[PDB]
Design a protein around this ligand. Structure first.
Ligand SMILES: Oc1ccc(Oc2ccccc2)cc1
Length: 209
């Protein structure tokens, strides 16, 4: 049972700007997704300070980067707080309507796309490099769900029958054909060292056969 939703007009406009604007510094997508993962890990850590049972779904707090050249996917996995179904539908837990408004005002006022994270909508920078994004998520208070969008104004949400996650979020980037440099170990390592050197959780870059 797959449910199809329309993006709010302002979010569709944000994604079309990300997809259509000429902007060479695409590597910032990874910084933005890792920062989102760190924010999600912060949230479940804070909740666990007064309720240790919040970690019954997994004690380890970490971020994994999993490139797969055969599938042409880059997956960012975190064991953070995850999102409920309501969170997924409500722009993946963001205030994306007001954030887009502030972002697009900054763009005509000098800013560039690399500052997207300052407006709370850094997730959508995934579409700098991905033709399709799949988000698998599990929150302690809900079931496991899969969100998916190839932009074009709509997204889908369905119950996920795949590998149980325990708790957290998995962002699967189905990369554009000319963006496969972000599957290379040395390229990912360079970006993490440049932009994510002070993230307070272990970031493990998986290798391939
Ligand atoms: O890109 C991401 C990464 C992790 C996400 O999960 C979160 C869940 C709750 C708060 C923040 C984040 C949401 C988007």
């Amino acid at each position: 049972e797959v449910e199809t939703f329309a993006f709010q007009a302002e979010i569709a406009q944000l994604m079309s700007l990300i997809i259509n604007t000429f902007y060479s510094n695409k590597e910032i997508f990874l910084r933005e997704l890792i920062s989102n993962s760190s924010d999600a890990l912060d949230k479940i850590r804070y909740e666990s300070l007064t309720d240790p049972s919040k970690l019954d779904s997994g004690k380890e707090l970490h971020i994994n980067l999993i490139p797969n050249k055969q599938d042409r996917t880059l997956t960012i996995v975190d064991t953070g707080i995850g999102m409920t179904k309501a969170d997924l539908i409500n722009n993946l837990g963001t205030i994306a309507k007001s954030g887009t408004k502030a972002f697009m005002e900054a763009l005509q006022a000098g800013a560039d796309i690399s500052m997207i994270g300052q407006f709370g909508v850094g997730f959508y920078s995934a579409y700098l490099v991905a033709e399709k994004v799949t988000v698998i998520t599990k929150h302690n208070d809900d079931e496991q769900y899969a969100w998916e969008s190839s932009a074009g104004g709509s997204f889908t949400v369905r119950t996920d029958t795949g590998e149980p996650m325990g708790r957290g979020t998995k962002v699967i980037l189905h990369l554009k054909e000319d963006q496969t440099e972000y599957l290379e170990e040395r390229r990912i390592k360079e970006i993490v060292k440049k932009h994510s050197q002070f993230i307070g959780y272990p970031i493990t870059l998986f290798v391939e056969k």
